[PDB]
Amino acid sequence: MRNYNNFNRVWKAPRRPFEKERLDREMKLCGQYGLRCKREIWRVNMTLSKMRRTARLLLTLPENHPRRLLEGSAIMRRCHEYGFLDEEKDKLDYVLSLTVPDILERRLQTIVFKAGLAKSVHHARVLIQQRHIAVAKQIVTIPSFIVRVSSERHIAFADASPFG
């Protein structure tokens, strides 16, 4: 009692447990991004849904409405950071079209593999827990670390690792 510490859900299980169309789409992502579980998919479905949904609400709204400017620019900024979107795209309509890969491409696991420090994505996911990759001078052990686009220059390897 009397302990106020807020906790929350990050993910949701889909209705219709097994559809061979979805399950197919699931596995095709699990093997491609080297994912441990479906759980890590359903997560970027909800962070994408929440994000998407406030894009609708603000979008249904009249232009120059004070929420649409302030609260609208902030969703439209944070997607330029993290590089969910390209800095060429600012309509706020673009937020309303995003896909599960966009947020998975940005996950430190794929990027360490894309940056080329690893064989595919399984080396990359182990090589993160093995504590060797550091983002900028900061060792980061979480595969799901979402890599801010300003930070994609700095990864390299740890200085406590074998590699430094």
Partner: protein, 258 residues
């Protein structure tokens, strides 16, 4: 007759984490009301940081090192609300407790000479035994033989050093006013006009600098100076002004670059 006051039920302005305690220090009756006041303990401990604990609260206070209103105060539960003057002679810092814009307590620093000055709103005016008139200030002072002109709603500029009332300030038409209470706190402006409403609140229209309009109940108005260009107290660094919420944000990004 309650004694304890819980964090979640403490006023938000004391600005005390929900975690890290069940309770907040409950202020005793005093000059200023419970819901609007900042205890001394929250001043030294949380605001000024001179004390990392409540244990260091009594270390510093019970020694009477920390003055408000020229008088040394021993009590961490003492309410010090607004217009108050909190001096520490040891370090040599001097604070007026005035509201910040954004509706928060800000501690203005002030010169040696201006801590003498304290100016207090006239909450009531009555006759004491033997025809003595008295004025009961927002602060809680009972001030005998005020100016024959003073009336409810006027400020009494009060010298806290030598104890006496220097010049007063009426309230009519344009006179600079700091809003105290009710969502416009700290926001300054002239009175543009006052609505009458006998038997109920008088709603009181104001105009900040650079033009803008807002209302309050006239019991949230505290007079200061004849014009908005002349004020008899030192207001916080953002004077009375509210920035647009979209200008506040994009100036925290530009400065964020360092």
């Amino acid at each position: 007759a309650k004694k304890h006051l819980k964090r979640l039920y403490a006023p938000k302005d004391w600005m005390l984490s929900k975690l890290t305690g069940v309770f907040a220090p409950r202020p005793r009756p005093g000059p200023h009301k419970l819901r609007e006041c900042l205890p001394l303990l929250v001043i030294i401990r949380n605001r000024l940081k001179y004390a990392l604990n409540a244990r260091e609260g009594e270390m510093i206070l019970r020694q009477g090192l920390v003055h408000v209103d020229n008088h040394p105060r021993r009590d961490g539960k003492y309410p010090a609300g607004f217009m108050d003057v909190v001096e520490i002679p040891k370090t040599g810092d001097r604070f007026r407790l005035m509201y910040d814009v954004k509706g928060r307590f800000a501690l203005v620093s002030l010169s040696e000479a201006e801590a003498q000055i304290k100016l207090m709103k006239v909450v009531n005016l009555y006759t004491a035994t033997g025809r003595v008139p008295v004025a009961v200030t927002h602060d809680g002072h009972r001030i005998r033989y005020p100016d024959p002109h003073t009336s409810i709603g006027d400020t009494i500029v009060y010298n806290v050093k030598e104890k006496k009332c220097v010049d007063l300030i009426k309230n009519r038409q344009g006179k600079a006013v700091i809003v105290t209470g009710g969502a416009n706190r700290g926001r300054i402006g002239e009175i543009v006009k006052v609505e009458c409403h006998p038997g109920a609140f008088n709603i009181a229209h104001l105009k900040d600098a650079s033009g803008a309009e807002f209302a309050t109940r006239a019991a949230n108005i505290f007079v200061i100076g004849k014009d908005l260009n002349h004020l008899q107290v030192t207001v916080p660094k953002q004077q009375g002004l509210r920035m647009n919420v979209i200008q506040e944000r994009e100036e925290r990004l530009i400065a964020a670059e360092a």
